[PDB]
Coordinates of C-alpha atoms in Angstrom, one line a residue:
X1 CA -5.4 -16.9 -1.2
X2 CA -4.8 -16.1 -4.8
X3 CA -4.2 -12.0 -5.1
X4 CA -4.7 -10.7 -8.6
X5 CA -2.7 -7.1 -9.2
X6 CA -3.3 -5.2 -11.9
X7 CA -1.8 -2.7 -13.1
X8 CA -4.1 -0.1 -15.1
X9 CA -1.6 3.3 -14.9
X10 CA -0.4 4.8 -18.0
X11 CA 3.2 3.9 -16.5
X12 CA 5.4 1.0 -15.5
X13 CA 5.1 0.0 -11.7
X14 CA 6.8 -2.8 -10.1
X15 CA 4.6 -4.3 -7.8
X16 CA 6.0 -5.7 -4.6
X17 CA 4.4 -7.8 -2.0
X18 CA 5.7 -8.9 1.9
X19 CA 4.9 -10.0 5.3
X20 CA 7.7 -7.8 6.8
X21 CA 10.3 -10.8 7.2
X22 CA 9.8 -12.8 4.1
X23 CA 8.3 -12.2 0.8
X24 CA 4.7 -13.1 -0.2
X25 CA 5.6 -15.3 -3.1
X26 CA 8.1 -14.0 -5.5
X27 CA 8.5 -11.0 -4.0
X28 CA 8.0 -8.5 -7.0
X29 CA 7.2 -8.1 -10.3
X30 CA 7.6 -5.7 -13.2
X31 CA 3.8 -4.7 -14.3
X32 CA 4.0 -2.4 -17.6
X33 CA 0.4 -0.8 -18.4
X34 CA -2.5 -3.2 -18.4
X35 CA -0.3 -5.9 -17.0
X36 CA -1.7 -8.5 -14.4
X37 CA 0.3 -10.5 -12.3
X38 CA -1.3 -13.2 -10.4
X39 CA 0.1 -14.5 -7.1
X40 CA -0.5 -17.0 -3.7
X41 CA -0.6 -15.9 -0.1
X42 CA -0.4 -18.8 2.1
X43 CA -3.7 -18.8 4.4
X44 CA -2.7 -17.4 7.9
X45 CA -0.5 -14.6 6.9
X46 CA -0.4 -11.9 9.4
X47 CA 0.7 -8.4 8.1
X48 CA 0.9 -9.2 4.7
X49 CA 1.2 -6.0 2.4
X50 CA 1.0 -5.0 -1.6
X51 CA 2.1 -1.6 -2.6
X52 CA 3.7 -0.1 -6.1
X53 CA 7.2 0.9 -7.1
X54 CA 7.6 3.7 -9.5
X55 CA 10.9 4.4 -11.7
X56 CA 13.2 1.6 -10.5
X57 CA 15.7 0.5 -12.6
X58 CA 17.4 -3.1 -11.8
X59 CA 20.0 -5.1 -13.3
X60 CA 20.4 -8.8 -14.5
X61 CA 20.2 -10.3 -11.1
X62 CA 17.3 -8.0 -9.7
X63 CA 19.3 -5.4 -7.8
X64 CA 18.5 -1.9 -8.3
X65 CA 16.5 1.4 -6.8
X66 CA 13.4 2.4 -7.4
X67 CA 12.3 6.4 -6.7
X68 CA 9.1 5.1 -4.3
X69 CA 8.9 2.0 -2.0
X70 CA 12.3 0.8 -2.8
X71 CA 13.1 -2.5 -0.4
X72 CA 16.4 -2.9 0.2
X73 CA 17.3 -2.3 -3.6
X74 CA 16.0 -5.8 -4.6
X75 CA 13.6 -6.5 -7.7
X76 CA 11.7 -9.5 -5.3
X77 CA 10.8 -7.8 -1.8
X78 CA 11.4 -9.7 1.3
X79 CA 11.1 -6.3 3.4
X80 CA 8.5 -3.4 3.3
X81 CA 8.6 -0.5 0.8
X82 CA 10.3 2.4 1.7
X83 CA 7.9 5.6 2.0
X84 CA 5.9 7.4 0.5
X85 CA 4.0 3.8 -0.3
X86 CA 0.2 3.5 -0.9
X87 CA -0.4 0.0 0.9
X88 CA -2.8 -2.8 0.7
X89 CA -2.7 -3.9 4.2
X90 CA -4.2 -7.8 5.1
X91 CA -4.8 -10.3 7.2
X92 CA -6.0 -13.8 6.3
X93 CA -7.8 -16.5 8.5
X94 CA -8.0 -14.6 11.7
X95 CA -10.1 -16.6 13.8
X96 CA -12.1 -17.5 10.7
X97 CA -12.0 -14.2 8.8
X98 CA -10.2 -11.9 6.8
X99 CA -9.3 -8.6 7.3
X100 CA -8.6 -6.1 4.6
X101 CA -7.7 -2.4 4.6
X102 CA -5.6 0.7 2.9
X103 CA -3.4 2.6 4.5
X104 CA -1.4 6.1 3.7
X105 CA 0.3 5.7 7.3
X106 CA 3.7 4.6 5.0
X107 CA 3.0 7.9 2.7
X108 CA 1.1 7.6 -0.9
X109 CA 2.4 7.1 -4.2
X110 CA 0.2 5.4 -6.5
X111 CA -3.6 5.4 -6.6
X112 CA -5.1 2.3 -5.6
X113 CA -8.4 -0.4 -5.6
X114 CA -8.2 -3.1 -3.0
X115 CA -11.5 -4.9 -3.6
X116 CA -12.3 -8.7 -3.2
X117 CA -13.3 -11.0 -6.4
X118 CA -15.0 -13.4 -4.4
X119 CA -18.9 -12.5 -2.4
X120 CA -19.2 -11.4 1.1
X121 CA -17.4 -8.1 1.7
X122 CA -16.9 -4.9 -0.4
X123 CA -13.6 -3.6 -1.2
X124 CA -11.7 -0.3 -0.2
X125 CA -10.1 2.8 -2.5
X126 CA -8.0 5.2 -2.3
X127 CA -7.7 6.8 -6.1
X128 CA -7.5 10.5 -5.3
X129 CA -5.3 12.4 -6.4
X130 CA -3.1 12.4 -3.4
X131 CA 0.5 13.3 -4.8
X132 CA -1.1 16.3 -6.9
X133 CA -2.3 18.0 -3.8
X134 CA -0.2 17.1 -1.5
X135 CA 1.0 19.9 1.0
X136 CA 4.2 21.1 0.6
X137 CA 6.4 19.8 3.6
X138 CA 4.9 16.6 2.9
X139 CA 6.1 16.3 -0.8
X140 CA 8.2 14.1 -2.0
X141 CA 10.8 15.3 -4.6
X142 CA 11.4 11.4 -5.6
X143 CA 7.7 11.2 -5.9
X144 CA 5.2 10.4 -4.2
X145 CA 3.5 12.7 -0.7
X146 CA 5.5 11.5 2.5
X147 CA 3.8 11.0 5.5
X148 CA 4.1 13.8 8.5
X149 CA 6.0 10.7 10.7
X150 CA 8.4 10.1 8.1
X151 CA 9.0 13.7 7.5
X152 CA 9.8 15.0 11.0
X153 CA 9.5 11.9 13.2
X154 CA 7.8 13.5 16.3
X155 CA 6.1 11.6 19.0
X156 CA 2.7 12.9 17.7
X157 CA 3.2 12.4 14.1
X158 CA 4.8 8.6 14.8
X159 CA 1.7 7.9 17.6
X160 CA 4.7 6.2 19.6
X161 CA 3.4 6.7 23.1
X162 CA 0.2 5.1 22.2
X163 CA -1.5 8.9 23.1
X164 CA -2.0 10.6 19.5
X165 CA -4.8 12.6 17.5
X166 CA -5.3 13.5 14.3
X167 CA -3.5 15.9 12.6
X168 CA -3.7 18.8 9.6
X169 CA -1.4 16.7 7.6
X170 CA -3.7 13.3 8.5
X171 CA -6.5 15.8 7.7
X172 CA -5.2 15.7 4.2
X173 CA -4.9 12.3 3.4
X174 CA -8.5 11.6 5.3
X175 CA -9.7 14.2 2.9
X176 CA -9.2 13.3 0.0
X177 CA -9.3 9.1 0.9
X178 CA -11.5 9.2 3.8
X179 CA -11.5 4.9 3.1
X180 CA -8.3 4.8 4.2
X181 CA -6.2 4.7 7.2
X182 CA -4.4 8.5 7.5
X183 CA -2.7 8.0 11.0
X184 CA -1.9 4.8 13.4
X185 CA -5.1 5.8 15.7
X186 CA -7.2 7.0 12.6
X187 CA -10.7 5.1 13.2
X188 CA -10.6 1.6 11.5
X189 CA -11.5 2.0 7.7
X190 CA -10.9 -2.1 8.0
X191 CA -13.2 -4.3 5.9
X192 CA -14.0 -7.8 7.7
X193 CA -14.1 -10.6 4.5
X194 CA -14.7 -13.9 4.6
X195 CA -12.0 -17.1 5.5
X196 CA -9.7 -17.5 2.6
X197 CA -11.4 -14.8 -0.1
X198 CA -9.4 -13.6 -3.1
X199 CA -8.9 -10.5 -4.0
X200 CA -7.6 -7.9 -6.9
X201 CA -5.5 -5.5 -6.0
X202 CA -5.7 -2.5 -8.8
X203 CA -3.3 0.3 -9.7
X204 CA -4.8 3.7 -11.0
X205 CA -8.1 2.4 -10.8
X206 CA -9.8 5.3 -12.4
X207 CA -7.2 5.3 -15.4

């Protein structure tokens, strides 16, 4: 699957891209404004995720720290983003489909288009402004609107026993993106594609 991610914010983002245990590819790439960077899932990837990186700053052999979804400090992922992280969530050739979705479970940090470039599925969005509105417990001072697990890491919050709702801060986030996921149990915003579609994944969409 080729995934195409632009970057169309005013600002530099490093884009970053795993499966959880291994990077997708490089890894991660610097993306200044209007930058596209063009990489290769291998078909069958399970749990495969794109998100943004805002003020990192890394050194000659791509170690460094960036304010939102750092991974471990590295300039190529091989681990998810640490929150808050606006997510491209995906799964290719399930059982002869693909399954595509964004999620603000992990927090939100940059605005964000996941939309296919090839026919038979429409694509998801989440460009509100999330981080300007964000409440006030949930607000990130690095950047960025946590999520209310990450915050204060309660059973309800973290939907650990399998047995949650929705909450005031998932409220939020369902508010203002209702396309995307706001907690684990949240009904399924998940778009069904095609077997091995491409897709573009766009930063600040609206910018």
């Amino acid at each position: 699957a080729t995934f195409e991610i632009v970057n169309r914010c005013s600002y530099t983002v490093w884009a970053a891209a795993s499966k959880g245990d291994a990077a997708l590819d490089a890894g991660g790439r610097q993306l200044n404004s209007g930058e596209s960077w063009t990489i290769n899932v291998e078909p069958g990837t399970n749990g495969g995720k794109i998100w943004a990186r805002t003020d990192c700053y890394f050194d000659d052999s791509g170690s460094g720290i960036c304010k939102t979804g750092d991974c471990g400090g590295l300039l190529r992922c091989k681990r998810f983003g640490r929150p808050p992280t606006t997510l491209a969530e995906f799964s290719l050739n399930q059982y002869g489909k693909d399954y595509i979705d964004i999620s603000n479970i992990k927090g939100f940090n940059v605005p964000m288009n996941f939309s296919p470039t090839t026919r038979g599925c429409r694509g998801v969005r989440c460009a509100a402004d999330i981080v300007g509105q964000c409440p006030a417990k949930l607000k990130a001072p690095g950047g960025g609107c946590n999520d209310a697990c990450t915050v204060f890491q309660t059973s309800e919050y973290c939907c650990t026993t399998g047995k949650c709702g929705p909450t005031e801060y998932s409220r939020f986030f369902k508010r203002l993106c209702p396309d995307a996921f706001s907690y684990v149990l949240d009904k399924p915003t998940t778009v069904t594609c095609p077997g091995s579609s491409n897709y573009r994944v766009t930063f600040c969409p609206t910018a």
